[PDB]
């Protein structure tokens, strides 16, 4: 209903990364659900994102190589990661297990976006960042 | 003190995806590079592979992916292997490929604040220029 955040991801990053992150976010009083937003190989990413944005104040995608390869049909994936509906907005994409070269091939525009990187940032740091935004902290 | 300029240790999953194009680029920049025999399969000995590569290669490097660290279950002290020195050869510039900060923190915490390359922030050509600068004293 009044969910704070949803996490779009690929099936491969669900238990490896998304679940601990969702639990860590729950520890900071952040309502987050992800089970229904796993991206299957034949699923439509746009449909999933708009559905989640209807019921969630904020959104984010876990960008891994699997993610961009799964939905082969997506040309303009760069626009999706900042999609906004009602007073809900998609924020802070998470570059998870992806290469700069891969991003350059599929969506070059994605390179110049505000994002988080799990190679340089831990789950706790990433959760604190998302919690800073969602909880209107230092503002 | 060897014939080959560089060898690349990697996991089986990054061989054709990453190590192959990177080695191809390195050869385009005049660096004798071989990686084909240094794939780390499950149950393999990382130390044995690294020492073997250092026998015939001036320099070495490891492609750190989550897969790579998962391979060697017997590897407790992985921090030392990525700077191992044998004869007059040294292991240089680890390449963080498809890894998490948490994953690295779990297996070898000392590596987290060590000089490395990141395939998420740097392209293959970008990474090869750094590698070739060091190996060829440019």
From Swiss-Prot, chain A:
Signal peptide extent: none
Enzyme class: hydrolase
Effect the entry attributes to changing residue 42 to A: Loss of NADase activity
Enzyme Commission identifier(s): 3.2.2.-, 3.2.2.6
Impact when changing residue 75 to A: Loss of NADase activity
Active site: 76
Record-annotated TIR domain positions: 2-134
Any one Gene Ontology BP term: signal transduction
Impact after mutating residue 72 to A: Decreased NADase activity, makes about 10% 2'cADPR, 4-fold increased production of ADPR
Outcome reported for the amino acid change (mutating residue 50 to A): Slowed NADase activity
Keywords: Coiled coil, Hydrolase, NAD
Record-listed NAD(+) binding positions: 11, 40, 70, 113
Catalytic activity from the UniProt record: NAD(+) = 2'cADPR + nicotinamide + H(+); NAD(+) + H2O = ADP-D-ribose + nicotinamide + H(+); NADP(+) + H2O = ADP-D-ribose 2'-phosphate + nicotinamide + H(+)
Residues marked Important for ADPR cyclization (site): 72
Domain remark in the UniProt entry: The TIR domain mediates NAD(+) hydrolase (NADase) activity. Self-association of TIR domains is required for NADase activity. The TIR domain alone is active and produces cADPR (residues 134-267).
Subunit structure: Homodimer. In the presence of NAD(+) analog 8-amino-isoquinoline adenine dinucleotide (3AD) forms filaments with 3AD between monomers; conformational changes occur upon 3AD binding.
Task performed by this protein: NAD(+) hydrolase (NADase) that catalyzes cleavage of NAD(+) into ADP-D-ribose (ADPR) and nicotinamide. In addition to ADPR, also generates a cyclization variant of cyclic ADPR (cADPR), termed 2'cADPR (v-cADPR). Cleaves NADP(+), but does not cyclize the product.
Name this protein carries in UniProt: 2' cyclic ADP-D-ribose synthase AbTIR
Organism: Acinetobacter baumannii (strain 1295743)
């Amino acid at each position: 209903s009044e969910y704070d955040l949803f996490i779009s991801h690929a099936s491969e990053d669900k238990e490896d990364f998304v679940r601990p992150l969702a639990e860590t976010l729950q520890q900071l009083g952040v309502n987050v659900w992800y089970d229904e937003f796993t991206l299957k190989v034949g699923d439509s990413l746009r449909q999933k994102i708009d559905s989640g944005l209807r019921n969630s104040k904020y959104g984010t995608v876990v960008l891994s190589t699997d993610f961009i390869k799964k939905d082969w049909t997506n040309y303009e994936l760069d626009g999706l990661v900042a999609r906004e509906m009602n007073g809900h907005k998609m924020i802070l994409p998470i570059w998870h297990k992806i290469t700069k070269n891969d991003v350059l091939d599929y969506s070059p525009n994605l390179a110049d976006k505000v994002a988080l990187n799990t190679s340089v940032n831990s789950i706790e740091e990433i959760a604190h960042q998302l919690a800073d935004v969602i909880l209107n902290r230092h503002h």
